[PDB]
Design a protein around this ligand. Structure first.
Ligand SMILES: Nc1ncnc2c1ncn2[C@@H]1O[C@H](CSCC[C@H](N)C(=O)O)[C@@H](O)[C@H]1O
Ligand SMILES: Nc1ncnc2c1ncn2[C@@H]1O[C@H](CSCC[C@H](N)C(=O)O)[C@@H](O)[C@H]1O
Lengths: 451, 445
C-alpha cells in the first residue's frame, strides 16, 4: 500500500502548522477538533486564526518559518503558498522524524490528510492518495450515503459497554458473538436515537442474558475460480470473519486478499486429505470460525463432502457456501456459454484425474448436443481426444482450453477436437477443457480480453 | 473527533515492532506492505519472522526490548503478550515523540490501527476503538464488497488524466459528471486490470468523445438461485451502478432488494425472448447502464447467450457476471454434493426443443441434475428404470433451493414420480448416489 492509515491520538501533542491562509485554517480546524496542542507559524494570518488565538485554542507565531518550532512536535503541516518555505518545513520535519503534510504537494511530504467521515467514536477516512481529490471528494459522499445516521450513537453506546462486555465474556469469541448481535439490533439503534433509556436497557439486559454458542464451525466456502469479484457475498462475509482460513493453490491471491488480516492462513496445497480433515478438525475443536476456502465450488470435484463427513462424525457444525465453479467462471469470461439455443441441451462436468481403478464412460461422453467440461484433464488431454474421437464425436468439434479463467492471467486457446492434445501443451494448470459447439460462440461473446 | 486519521508514507522509514508472535506478524505484514524499513524485536520469533529476515525484508533483534532501537523510528508497535514490555515500548516511544500502537490496549498509546480497505492509492480506513473490531469488520466487509478490487488502478489513472479533463470540461459539474462515469466504467477498469493498454485508450477517448449523458452498456448478471448472499461481489457492484434492471421471477425478491433504489426496474417475466432482447438494446441505446438480472447463472439454461447476440451486433458494450447455478446452490444447501469420491465421475446439468438421450442419461457413476424437468418427471422415472438404472437409486427434488422456502423431498427412483408432484417450480431433480449423502451433510435447517 502507498500509505499506512493510522488514527493518531493528538491530545496534548504539539503540532505545527506553517502558513496562515484558508488552507492552514482548514487543517488547523481538524487538528483542533483532534485536541492537538497547535502552533501556527506564518507571516500573515486570516482573521479566523486571531479568533482562535484570542480564545487560547492555539499559538500564533507571526513571522517567517522557525525550524525550532518543530523540536517538540509530533505532526507538521506546511500550508503556505511558498513551495520554497514548504520544503524548508518538510526538510526540518524529516531530520526530526516528524510526520509532515505538505498540503499543496501530497507526494512530497510524509503523511497525507484524508477525507474524514466523523461519526465519533466511529471514524472513516478516505483518500485517493491526494493524486485524485475528486474521488475522495466523492467516495466520501458515497460512504456518507452508506453509514446509517445513528451509527455514531450505536458505536458510542458500544464504547460505554466495552468494559462490561469484557468483564462478562472471558474469551474473544464470546465478545465477538455479543458484538455481532448488538450491532444488528435495529430496535436498540432506534431506542438510542430516541434517548429511550427504558428501551435501551431492556434490550441490553436481554442481550447479555442470552447464552452464547461456544462451538467452532467449519464453513466450506467456494472461492470461485480466481477473480476476487466472483466470491459470493456470503463467502466474503465468511472470510471477513474467519479465525482460520485453510486454502490451497487454487484459491487466487486476490481472493486471499479479502481474508481479514486477523485470520490465521493455513496453506495445505502441495497434501493427504486425511491430514486436511484433521487440520479443520483440530482448529474447529478449538472453538474457532474455520473456513475451508476452496477454488471454484466446494462440491464439484472438491473432495468437500469428505472433510464434512468427518466433522459431522465429530459433532462439529458446518455449512457450505457454494462458489462459481470453474465451468461457470470460464464460461462467462471466455464468451463460451455452457448452454445455448440447441447447441447444447446438457452440460457435463467431468473429472480427468480418475481413481486408479477404471476409466471414464467415453461412449456416454461422446453424445451429441452436450457441452463437455473436463476438470484437471490436462495430462489426459491426449487420451480425451483419442477416446472422444473413438466413440464418435466429430473431429471438428470446437474445443477450448481456459487457463486461469477469470484472472488477469487468463489465457484461452481454442480449436477443434483433433487439436486437443496439442492445445493442452500450450496452457498449464489450472486449465479447463471445454468441448462442444458453444465454443464457437466465443467470437461473438468474448468481452474479457486476449491475454 | 478523538483520533486524527492520517495516511503515513512509510516507505524507507524505520519502524519498530516489539513482539514475535501471531499478533506482531500481522502488524509486521501490514508495515511491510506499506514499505516500512522494519525492525522486529522479540524474545523469540515465530518462523514467519525468520523467513522474512532470511529474505532481508526486515531486521530481527533477538532479546529484551532495547529502547535505543527506537532512536530513529517513525512508528512503534507494541505487539507482545506482556503488558510490562508494551508499556516499556509505549513510554520509550512517547518520550521520543514516536507514534506508537499497543495492539491489545488501543487507548494505551498514540495511535490505533484502523480497519483498512486497500485499493492503493485509494484507501479507506475505519475504526471505532480497538480490541474487538466487530463494528469496523461489518463496515469493512460491506466496503470490501462494494469497492471493486481494481479500483486503485482506476484511481491511479484518474490522477494522470486530471489535466486533460479540465481542458475539455469547463465547469466543475461537467468534470464531476465525467468522473462519476469514469469510476464506474467497467471496460476501463478491466482494461487497466488486464494491462490492455489498447483497450484503455479506446475506452478513454470514448469517455471523452461520447456524450456526457451516454453510459450505455448491458451487464448480464447471474443472480444465483435465490439466496441474496449467493450474489457475487461484482454482481452486487453492477446492480448498484445500474440505471435500469431487467429481471424476471427467477430473480428472488431478496436479490431485487439489493437493487439501487433510483434504478428503473423492468419485469420481463410472466414474454417471449425477442421482446426481452429488444428491451435490453432499446435501453442501452438510450445511454443507460442496463443490468439484466437472471436467475442462477446467465449461461446455464438462461438464454444468456441469445441476449448478448442482439447487443454485440449493435455496438453496445456488454459483460457477463457469472452466477451460482441452481445445481451448485441446491447441492450446497441440500447437503447433496454433486461429486463425492468415486460416486460420480461426472455431473450432468440437463433441461426438461428436440429430443433427450435416455440410455445416456441412465449410465452409472453420474449425478443427474434436471432443470425445468418437473413436468417431464413421470417420464423420467419410467425411462431411467426402463434403461437399466437400479431401482434403489437415490433421487431428490430440491424446490426453491437456497431460499428460506427450500423444500427437499428424497427417496429412490421408484418413488420419483410421486415425489415430483409433491413439489412445484422452481425445482431441481437430482438423481445419483450422492443423494444418499444428504443424511450426513444436510446443514441447511
Ligand atoms: N481458474 C480456473 N481456470 C480454469 N480451470 C480451473 C480454474 N480453477 C479451477 N479449475 C479447474 O478445476 C480443477 C480443480 S478440481 C476443483 C474445481 C473446483 N471445485 C470448481 O468447482 O471449479 C483444475 O484442474 C482446473 O481444471
Ligand atoms: N432456487 C432454485 N431451486 C431449484 N431449482 C431452481 C432454482 N432456481 C432455478 N431453478 C431451476 O432452473 C430452472 C430454470 S432454467 C434457468 C437456470 C439458471 N440460469 C441457473 O443457472 O440456475 C427451473 O425450472 C428450476 O428447475
Amino acid at each position: 500500500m502507498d500509505h499506512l492509515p493510522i488514527f493518531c491520538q493528538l491530545r496534548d501533542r504539539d503540532c505545527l502548522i506553517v502558513g496562515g491562509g484558508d488552507v492552514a485554517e482548514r487543517k488547523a480546524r481538524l487538528l483542533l477538533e483532534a485536541g492537538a496542542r497547535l502552533t501556527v507559524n506564518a507571516l500573515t494570518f486570516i482573521p479566523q486564526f486571531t479568533v482562535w488565538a484570542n480564545e487560547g485554542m492555539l499559538t500564533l507565531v507571526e513571522g517567517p518559518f522557525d525550524e525550532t518550532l518543530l523540536d517538540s512536535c509530533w505532526l507538521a503541516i506546511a500550508a503556505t503558498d511558498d513551495d520554497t518555505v514548504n520544503q524548508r518545513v518538510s526538510d526540518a520535519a524529516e531530520s526530526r522524524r516528524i510526520f509532515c503534510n505538505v498540503v499543496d504537494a501530497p507526494k512530497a511530504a510524509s503523511f497525507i490528510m484524508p477525507s474524514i467521515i466523523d461519526r465519533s467514536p466511529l471514524m472513516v477516512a478516505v483518500s485517493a492518495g491526494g493524486t485524485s481529490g475528486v474521488l475522495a471528494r466523492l467516495l466520501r459522499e458515497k460512504l456518507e450515503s452508506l453509514l446509517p445516521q445513528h451509527l455514531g450513537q450505536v458505536a458510542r453506546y458500544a464504547g460505554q459497554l466495552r468494559a462490561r462486555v469484557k468483564k462478562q465474556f472471558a474469551t474473544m469469541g464470546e465478545r465477538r458473538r455479543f458484538w455481532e448481535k448488538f450491532f444488528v439490533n435495529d430496535r436498540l439503534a432506534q431506542s438510542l436515537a430516541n434517548a429511550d433509556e427504558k428501551a435501551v436497557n431492556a434490550t441490553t439486559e436481554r442481550l447479555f442474558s442470552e447464552p452464547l454458542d461456544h462451538r467452532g464451525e467449519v464453513v466450506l466456502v467456494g472461492a470461485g475460480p480466481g477473480d476476487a469479484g466472483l466470491l459470493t457475498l456470503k463467502g466474503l462475509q465468511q472470510i471477513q470473519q474467519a479465525d482460520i482460513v485453510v486454502y490451497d493453490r487454487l484459491v487466487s491471491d486476490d481472493i486471499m486478499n479479502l481474508v481479514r488480516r486477523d485470520a490465521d492462513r493455513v496453506f495445505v496445497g502441495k497434501v493427504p486429505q486425511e491430514e486436511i480433515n484433521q487440520i479443520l478438525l483440530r482448529e474447529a475443536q478449538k472453538g474457532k470460525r474455520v473456513v475451508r476456502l476452496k477454488g471454484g465450488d466446494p462440491f464439484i470435484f472438491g473432495r468437500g463432502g469428505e472433510e464434512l463427513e468427518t466433522l459431522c462424525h465429530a459433532g462439529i457444525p458446518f455449512s457450505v457456501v457454494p462458489g462459481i465453479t470453474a465451468a461457470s467462471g470460464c464460461s462467462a469470461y471466455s464468451g463460451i456459454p455452457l448452454t445455448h439455443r440447441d447447441y447444447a441441451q446438457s452440460v457435463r462436468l467431468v473429472t480427468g484425474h480418475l481413481k486408479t481403478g477404471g476409466e471414464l464412460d467415453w461412449e456416454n461422453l461422446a453424445a451429441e448436443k452436450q457441452t463437455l467440461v473436463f476438470y484437471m484433464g490436462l495430462n489426459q488431454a491426449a487420451t480425451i481426444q483419442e477416446k472422444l474421437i473413438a466413440f464418435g464425436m466429430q473431429a471438428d468439434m470446437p474445443v477450448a482450453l481456459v487457463e486461469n479463467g477469470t484472472s488477469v492471467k487468463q489465457r484461452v486457446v481454442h480449436g477443434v477436437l483433433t487439436q486437443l492434445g496439442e492445445l493442452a501443451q500450450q496452457v498449464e494448470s489450472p486449465a479447463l477443457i471445454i468441448v462442444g459447439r458453444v465454443v464457437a460462440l466465443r467470437d461473438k461473446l468474448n468481452w474479457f480480453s486476449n491475454h
